Design a protein around this nucleic acid. Structure first.
Ligand SMILES: Nc1ncnc2c1ncn2[C@@H]1O[C@H](COP(=O)(O)OP(=O)(O)OP(=O)(O)O)[C@@H](O)[C@H]1O
Ligand SMILES: [Mg+2]
Length: 858
DNA sequence: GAATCGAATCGCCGC
RNA sequence: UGCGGCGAU
DNA sequence: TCGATTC
């Protein structure tokens, strides 16, 4: 209802608390302490205003129950409501006479679905509708109950398997009106197939819809004291009305909770002084003692955070503190360019003036619908990044606090950060530059070639590309609005940032102070790291771990492999055959042709397979994708765009072409990156054995409990993997699904063990690289995006060294898979040792060759 | 045990 | 939390 | 397609 303002006492404290002010003043003066504390004050005040506007919107739209402030209320109210409507059924079944009107209607819908639909629509009508009458509420319940009753039988019974293909398309619909209108078309569709038993819904008359909710408000009042009954002008047969009113104690409960949440979600802005050095778990980054302190590790529970207060990880704490100390400044030159073209185009790069029938128009309709959502979503994030960039444009330097996710990858904390998109990366440059010199100018050109998309080509031709395009780079720097060439590039705003620094060198020579971050992006991190542990020679060569004759394109290597299978299958492949295929719901038994590998090879060679067909499949390998997931990928990535554009005529049956290509890609990656495939299988089997509760079937009691997965990275960071699942969840078709120590989810443990392990290794590599570049060399400024390592051009050659030396030091010292085995080997039940796979065999790779690989980049 | 389901992390915006 | 959309890796 | 979860 009426939320307290938290700012009058709580948000004033962060500016006036004298312990945080003094610790900030002692480091960077009292004046910068006053601006920084007032900025963190604005960050909390902006965050309270963000909550109050979203709360006001949910108030008008009746979605107050969807807000977090009403959730713990409804959690303690739902058991009492289900039991009253349950016990009322048993009473009416025992009472003689005719059943009440509502009794038959309340049965077809799930009883827990009654409880939520009544609670949500009561506070929807009591907060937005202004009509507090018992009839407008009770009817509004009854229409919402009939909607879940009528279209719920689609989800529940007569099409539960067929529900799985309409469920996604219903989720894409935005709005309860659009979700219902879509449900009307599917209902008419299945009834034409006789799927819902051939029984069409008889719509409830307006009298019963009120009678359903009237009993529902009564059962709400009988069970809980959420709403109280009121009668006005009693006895007057013309004015006798009944209204309902929210209990003031419960409206006070949501207002107190909403005020508490408003002071808890801030809008994290950059720092005008260097960030608070992390000494412990909390309170780092920002300097003030706020209501939400920054956690060093972003954990989903406060218990998983508490395990980090005992551990001694001095090398971990150093690397975040060094990465915090890197002073950035807003690139004013690209800010001048971005400020004008954003006023003319929605996206400044999206358009540039350069040189089965019914399912098709449905597919194009879903494309312009998603693209309409995509353009409005892309623009609002752009307008915020531009406002933050224009805000801190005049400051001599700004700083970003850093923490880490529960695996150890480091992330900046502020919303505007150097880990953003191409434009956000372009608006941000380092502040403390050095004279560029010969080596820095060389790497500045290599960075400019990478921004243009010329990264598949060895270094001398990258320099040649820049030198050939000298007059175009100079024209873009002199007049960026008159020469749109930089906008046509792959990373356009970061490329234009290079153009300004390139022109600055041609003007002021090699003594030019350049503070541009020069990012070195390692090729495929997970495969690089997986091939490093098990020492895969061919796998490392595929990801440029080895010094190669040229830049190795792993997608092109896999595309080369599938093309060799394609040519062999076009000759010696299987012919076509006719198989009987039955769809179980229809029950039909028809004959369809099954393309053999000879025919399917001829289709794909007619399409012409390149690195683009195999690209996304290789990239999602470290996330766990295998032969199934490739089949879905190549269907929507290459086959479906082909048939939409006029190609794909060779794909007579596209799912057979997808599954055939899926098989072919999987045989190719599995023999190209053998150490990647073997290591994720070893981690998956380890997490499977730990996530299982063992019990002898003749004993029953559990001999071993659900065990989590635990390891420590080589720089000392520990990580607990404990995916947990709730026990009860409920979903509604037209309304949001709401919930009703906890068990470990064995599937998510196995699904996530291999990506999180290799992500923890690359975060340890990024952490170790930051300290090695800072203590062996004099590097102070760091651009870090998990995969990419960037610094000023003068320090670029040394960061190029340090990112290589760390990986070969890490894997020469620690066998990360053998140390992983030493963690869980005690936790294994005696019946599981025979099933546990052995450690994969080490290969012929020399780690020292990484030190002389140009294209590892990292 | 036959039946049934599944096929990485982080942040922002909306419902 | 879930769902939709965007971005980063 | 194929083995873990889950009726
Ligand atoms: N590390 C990553 N993991 C998964 N997807 C990624 C990653 N980096 C980028 N993408 C996605 O890949 C697509 C763009 O591919 P991108 O150009 O970045 O690939 P690449 O590895 O540089 O290859 P190439 O230069 O051959 O195109 C986008 O959908 C982007 O979101
Ligand atoms: Mg690229």
């Amino acid at each position: 209802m009426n939320t307290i303002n938290i700012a009058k006492n709580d948000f004033s404290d962060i500016e006036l608390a004298a312990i945080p002010f003094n610790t900030l003043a002692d480091h960077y003066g009292e004046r910068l302490a006053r601006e920084q504390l007032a900025l963190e004050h604005e960050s909390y005040e902006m965050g309270e205003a963000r909550f109050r506007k979203m709360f006001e919107r949910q108030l008008k739209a009746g979605e107050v129950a969807d807000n977090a402030a009403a959730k713990p209320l409804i959690t303690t109210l739902l058991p009492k409501m289900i039991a009253r409507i349950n016990d009322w059924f048993e009473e009416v079944k025992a009472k003689r006479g005719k059943r009440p009107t509502a009794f038959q209607f309340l049965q077809e819908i799930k009883p827990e679905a009654v409880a939520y639909i009544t609670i949500k629509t009561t506070l929807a009508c009591l907060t937005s509708a202004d009509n507090t009458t018992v009839q407008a509420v009770a009817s509004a319940i009854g229409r919402a109950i009939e909607d879940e009753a009528r279209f719920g039988r689609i989800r529940d019974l007569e099409a539960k398997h067929f529900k799985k293909n309409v469920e996604e398309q219903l989720n894409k619909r935005v709005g309860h009106v659009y979700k219902k209108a879509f449900m009307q078309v599917v209902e008419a569709d299945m009834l034409s197939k006789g799927l819902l038993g051939g029984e069409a819904w008889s719509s409830w008359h307006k009298e019963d819809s009120i009678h359903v909710g009237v009993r529902c408000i009564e059962m709400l009042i009988e069970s809980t004291g959420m709403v109280s009954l009121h009668r006005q002008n009693a006895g007057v047969v013309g004015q006798d009305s009944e209204t309902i009113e929210l209990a003031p104690e419960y409206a006070e409960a949501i207002a107190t909770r909403a005020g508490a949440l408003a002071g808890i979600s801030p809008m994290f802005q950059p720092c005008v002084v260097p960030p608070k050095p992390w000494t412990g778990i909390t309170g780092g980054g920002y300097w003030a003692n706020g209501r939400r302190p920054l956690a060093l590790v972003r954990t989903h529970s406060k218990k998983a955070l508490m395990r980090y207060e005992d551990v001694y990880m001095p090398e971990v704490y150093k690397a975040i503190n060094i990465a915090q100390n890197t002073a950035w400044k807003i690139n004013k030159k690209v800010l001048a360019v971005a400020n004008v073209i954003t006023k003319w185009k929605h996206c400044p790069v999206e358009d540039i003036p350069a040189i089965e029938a019914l399912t098709a128009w449905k597919r194009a309709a879903a494309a312009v619908y998603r693209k309409d959502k995509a353009r409005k979503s892309r623009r609002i994030s752009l307008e915020f990044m531009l406002e933050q960039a224009n805000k801190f444009a005049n400051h001599k330097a700004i700083w970003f606090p850093y923490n880490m996710d529960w695996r150890g990858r480091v992330y900046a904390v502020s919303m505007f950060n150097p880990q953003g998109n191409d434009m956000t990366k372009g608006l941000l440059t380092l502040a403390k530059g050095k004279p560029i010199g010969k080596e820095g100018y060389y790497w500045l050109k290599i960075h400019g070639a990478n921004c243009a998309g010329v990264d598949k080509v060895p270094f001398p031709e990258r320099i040649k590309f820049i030198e050939e395009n000298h007059e175009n780079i100079m024209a873009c720097a002199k007049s960026p609005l008159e020469n749109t060439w930089w906008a046509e590039q792959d990373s356009p705003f970061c490329f234009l940032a290079f153009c300004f620094e390139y022109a600055g060198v041609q003007h002021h020579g090699l003594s030019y102070n350049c503070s541009l971050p020069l990012a070195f992006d390692g090729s495929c991190s997970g495969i690089q790291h997986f091939s490093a542990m098990l020492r895969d020679e061919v796998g490392g060569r595929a990801v440029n771990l080895l010094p190669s004759e040229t830049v190795q394109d792993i997608y092109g290597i896999v595309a080369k492999k599938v093309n060799e299978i394609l040519q062999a299958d076009a000759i010696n492949g299987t012919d076509n055959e006719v198989v009987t295929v039955t769809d179980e719901n229809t029950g039909e038994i028809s004959e369809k042709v099954k393309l053999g590998t000879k025919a399917l090879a001829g289709q794909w060679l007619a399409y012409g397979v390149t690195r683009s067909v195999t690209k996304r499949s290789v990239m999602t390998l470290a996330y766990g994708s295998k032969e199934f997931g490739f089949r879905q990928q190549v269907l929507e990535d290459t086959i479906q765009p082909a048939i939409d554009s006029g190609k794909g005529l060779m794909f007579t049956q596209p799912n057979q072409a997808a599954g055939y290509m899926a098989k072919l890609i999987w045989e190719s990656v599995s023999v190209t990156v053998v150490a990647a495939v073997e290591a994720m299988n070893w981690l998956k089997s380890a997490a499977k054995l730990l996530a299982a509760e063992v019990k002898d079937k003749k004993t029953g009691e559990i001999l071993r409990k659900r065990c989590a997965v635990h390891w420590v990275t080589p720089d000392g960071f520990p990580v607990w993997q404990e995916y947990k699942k709730p026990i009860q969840t409920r979903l509604n078709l037209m309304f949001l699904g709401q919930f009703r120590d906890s068990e470990i989810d064995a599937h998510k443990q196995e699904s996530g063990i291999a990506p999180n392990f290799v992500h923890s290794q690359d975060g340890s590599h990024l952490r170790k690289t930051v300290v090695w570049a800072h203590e062996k060399y004099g590097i102070e400024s760091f651009a870090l995006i998990h995969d990419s390592f960037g610094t000023i051009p003068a320090d670029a050659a040394n960061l190029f060294k340090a990112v290589r030396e760390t990986m070969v030091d890490t894997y020469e010292s620690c066998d990360v898979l053998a140390d992983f085995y030493d963690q869980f080997a005690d936790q294994l039940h005696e019946s599981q040792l025979d099933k546990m796979p052995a450690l994969p065999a080490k290969g012929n790779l020399n780690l020292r060759d990484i030190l002389e690989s140009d294209f590892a980049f990292a």
